[PDB]
Structures are given as C-alpha cells and as structure tokens.
Amino acid sequence: AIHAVCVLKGDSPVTGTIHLKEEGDMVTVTGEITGLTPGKHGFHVHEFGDNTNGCTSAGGHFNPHGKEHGAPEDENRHAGDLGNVVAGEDGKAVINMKDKLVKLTGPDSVIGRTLVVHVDEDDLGRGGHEQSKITGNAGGRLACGVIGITK
Amino acid sequence: AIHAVCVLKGDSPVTGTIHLKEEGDMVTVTGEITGLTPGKHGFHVHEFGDNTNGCTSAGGHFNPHGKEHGAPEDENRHAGDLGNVVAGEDGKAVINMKDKLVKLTGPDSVIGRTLVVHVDEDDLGRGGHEQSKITGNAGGRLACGVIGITK
Numbered sequence: 188a189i190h191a192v193c194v195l196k197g198d199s200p201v202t203g204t205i206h207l208k209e210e211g212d213m214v215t216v217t218g219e220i221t222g223l224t225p226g227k228h229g230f231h232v233h234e235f236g237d238n239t240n241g242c243t244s245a246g247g248h249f250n251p252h253g254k255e256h257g258a259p260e261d262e263n264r265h266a267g268d269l270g271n272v273v274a275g276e277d278g279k280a281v282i283n284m285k286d287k288l289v290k291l292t293g294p295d296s297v298i299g300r301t302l303v304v305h306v307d308e309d310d311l312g313r314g315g316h317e318q319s320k321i322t323g324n325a326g327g328r329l330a331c332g333v334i335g336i337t338k
Numbered sequence: 339a340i341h342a343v344c345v346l347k348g349d350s351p352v353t354g355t356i357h358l359k360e361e362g363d364m365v366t367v368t369g370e371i372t373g374l375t376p377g378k379h380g381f382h383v384h385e386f387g388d389n390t391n392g393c394t395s396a397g398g399h400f401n402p403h404g405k406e407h408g409a410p411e412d413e414n415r416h417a418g419d420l421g422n423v424v425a426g427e428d429g430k431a432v433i434n435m436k437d438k439l440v441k442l443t444g445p446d447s448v449i450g451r452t453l454v455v456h457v458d459e460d461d462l463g464r465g466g467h468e469q470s471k472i473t474g475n476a477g478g479r480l481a482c483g484v485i486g487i488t489k
C-alpha cells in the first residue's frame with residue numbers, strides 16, 4: 188500500500204499533519220488540523236506542490252477530469268474535492284475519510300501535489316456564488332503542504 | 339516535460355528554491371541556496387517527503403538500486419547522490435546540473451521525495467569515515483523541502 192503525509196503551514200496559526208494511505212480500493216485520509224475558527228473549513232487537493240508563493244502557488248483544485256467543483260460524494264467534482272473539515276469549539280478538526288478519486292499512484296496521483304485548508308466553508312458547488320462551481324467559495328488559504336511519500 | 343520545484347527550509351537560516359525539469363534524457367536541476375557557510379555542502383535526494391520531524395524524517399538518501407554512496411558521475415551511487423553545492427564567500431550556492439539517475443516519472447521518480455542540503459561537505463564515498471559510503475559524511479541537515487509538481 189502506498190503511504191503519504193502532508194504537513195500544513197501557512198500565513199496563519201493553523202498547523203496539522205495529514206496522513207494518506209491506500210486501503211482497499213480507496214485512499215484513507217486521516218489527521219488533525221489545529222488553530223482554526225470553529226466550524227467548517229474547505230479542504231482540497233490543489234494541483235501544484237509549489238510553495239514559492241505561500242499557498243497561492245499551489246494553484247487551483249486538482250482537476251484532471253475537467254469537472255466542476257462539487258461535494259466528495261458527487262460524480263461532477265474535482266478529483267481534489269474533499270469537502271470540509273469541521274473544527275470544534277477548541278479550533279481542532281479531525282479527518283477520517285475514504286475517497287475514491289484521490290489516488291497515490293497512476294495518472295491521477297496526488298503525490299507531489301498540495302493539501303490546502305481554507306478560511307471559509309466550502310459550499311460544495313451549491314452556494315449560488317460565482318466561485319461556487321470553481322472553489323466552493325472557500326476563500327483564502329490558511330495553511331498548506333506538499334504531499335510526500337512516507338514509510 | 340515534467341517540471342518540479344522544491345522550497346528548502348530547516349533549523350538554520352538556509353533557504354532556497356530548486357527547480358527540476360525533464361530535458362532530453364536527463365533531469366536538469368537549477369536554483370540558488372543562501373545562508374550557507376562558504377564552501378562545499380552535501381546535496382541529495384532523500385527517500386521520504388516527510389516533514390513531521392524537521393529534515394530528520396526525510397530518511398536516508400534515495401537508493402532504489404541498493405548501491406553505496408558515491409559521486410554523481412559514479413555508477414555505484416545512490417539515485418539521490420547529487421554531490422555538493424558550492425557556496426561562495428557570500429554564502430550563496432547556485433545549482434545547474436544535469437543528472438541521469440534523478441527521474442521525475444517512473445519507478446525512480448523523486449516527486450514527493452525530499453531535497454536536503456547539509457552542514458558539511460559530501461566526501462563522495464572517499465573520505466575514509468564510517469559514514470562515507472552511507473551519507474558521504476555530510477553531517478546534519480540545514481534545510482530541506484518536499485519535491486512537488488509545478489507548471
């Protein structure tokens with residue numbers, strides 16, 4: 188099974204470590220993000236593992252299939268669309284999801300790409316804003332990291 | 339041609355950005371590293387893109403072929419063995435090399451792995467120390483980054 192990891196940092200107090208592994212036919216994503224305002228924050232794979240300009244140089248959502256932005260359960264979603272993480276009142280969000288479009292091998296591998304956690308909630312394409320079908324209108328980028336191979 | 343990038347940071351003042359691209363049958367590695375003591379500093383691809391424990395969690399040199407540590411021109415070298423960068427008197431080293439064992443695709447891809455710049459010179463396996471044929475006796479890790487996909 189391939190294993191990957193991602194250490195998130197950015198222009199905010201938000202930190203955390205995300206683990207990714209192949210498990211059966213999906214990828215299991217786990218970890219904790221801290222320093223968040225309570226509530227939902229968008230969380231996606233972005234196309235580029237490029238930290239030359241903070242989290243901005245990560246580019247847009249990873250979208251090898253040319254779909255609109257959606258919810259993780261949708262067919263019409265970016266490969267990178269992992270929805271929201273939910274921070275508790277203490278500012279900490281925990282992840283434990285299984286995804287069928289995130290890959291750690293093959294043409295749609297996310298190795299060397301970026302995870303981003305956002306300022307605002309991801310509206311899952313349904314918020315009625317110009318950015319809804321692009322980004323989920325999730326606003327700016329609190330923290331990000333390049334997805335790397337681990338043991 | 340695949341393009342990658344790596345932003346180096348660590349427990350030191352050393353920073354820099356490294357670009358990697360496929361060019362003909364090799365990979366071209368370019369960039370500048372700053373904040374170094376003048377002279378030679380070891381520079382390698384390490385196996386893991388894992389920043390959970392600073393540069394230590396990058397593991398050892400990337401060595402998919404089970405070779406000893408050597409010089410870049412050698413057959414008996416780790417795939418990750420890029421020799422030394424040379425910092426000038428102003429503490430800045432510039433890279434411009436072409437390598438045949440670094441890959442950005444296939445089984446030996448370095449996407450999602452780490453570049454490390456070291457405290458000491460890499461002795462290229464020839465220094466006569468116990469670590470020479472392991473690490474080049476290059477000492478600790480000044481800065482590192484995960485190798486990511488870019489445009």
Ligand SMILES: [Cu+]
Binds near residue numbers: 229232248304305
């Ligand atoms: Cu995002």
Ligand SMILES: [Cu+]
Binds near residue numbers: 380
């Ligand atoms: Cu090294």
Ligand SMILES: [Zn+2]
Binds near residue numbers: 231248267268323
């Ligand atoms: Zn999206």
Ligand SMILES: [Zn+2]
Binds near residue numbers: 406416472473474
């Ligand atoms: Zn080596």
